[PDB]
C-alpha cells in the first residue's frame, strides 16, 4: 500500500534499540565503572576539540573510497604498534570517536569493526595505566 515510510521506520528502530542496549549496559556498571566511563567521555571530547584540525586531516586520509576496513584499521593502529603510552592510546581512541561521530549514515558495524579485536585489545593492555592517566 503506502511504502514511502518503510525505510524511515527501519532506520529509527535500529537507532532506538541500539540506544536501549547501551542503557541496559550502563545500568549494570557499578559506580566506579560509571566514573571511569565519564572520564573517557570527557577526555575524548577535550582531545577532539583541541586537536580538531589534526584529526580532520587524519580523517580525510581514511575517508577516501579506495580503502577497506582492514586498511583503515592498519593505518590507525600503526602508532600503537610501536608506541603504547597512554597519551597515544587516548589520541587513538579520540580519533576513533571522531570517526564514529562522522559516519552516522554508515552501518554501525563499519565503525565497530575498526575498534573491535586488535585495537581495543591494544588499548586495554595495561588498562590500569590508561585509567590512571585519565583519572
Amino acid at each position: 500500500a503506502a511504502i514511502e515510510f518503510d525505510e524511515i521506520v527501519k532506520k529509527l528502530l535500529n537507532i532506538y534499540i541500539n540506544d536501549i542496549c547501551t542503557t541496559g549496559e550502563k545500568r549494570l556498571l557499578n559506580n566506579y565503572e560509571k566514573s571511569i566511563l565519564d572520564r573517557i567521555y570527557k577526555s575524548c571530547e577535550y582531545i577532539k576539540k583541541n586537536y580538531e584540525l589534526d584529526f580532520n586531516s587524519m580523517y580525510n586520509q581514511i575517508n577516501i573510497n579506495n580503502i577497506t576496513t582492514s586498511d583503515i584499521k592498519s593505518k590507525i593502529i600503526e602508532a600503537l604498534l610501536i608506541d603504547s603510552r597512554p597519551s597515544v592510546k587516548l589520541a587513538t581512541l579520540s580519533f576513533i570517536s571522531l570517526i564514529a561521530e562522522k559516519w552516522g549514515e554508515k552501518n554501525r558495524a563499519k565503525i565497530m569493526e575498526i575498534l573491535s579485536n586488535e585495537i581495543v585489545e591494544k588499548i586495554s593492555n595495561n588498562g590500569k595505566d590508561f585509567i590512571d592517566f585519565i583519572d
Binding site: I47, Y51, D54, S57, M58, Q61, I62, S74, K75, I76, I77, E78, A79, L81, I82, D83, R85, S87, V88, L90, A91, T92, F95, F133
Partner: peptide, 22 residues
Amino acid sequence: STMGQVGRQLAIIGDDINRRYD
C-alpha cells in the same frame, strides 16, 4: 623509517598530550 601519516600524526598528538598533562 617512515610511519604512515595517520600514525605519524597520532604520535605527534600523543607527545603533545603528554606534555600538557604534566
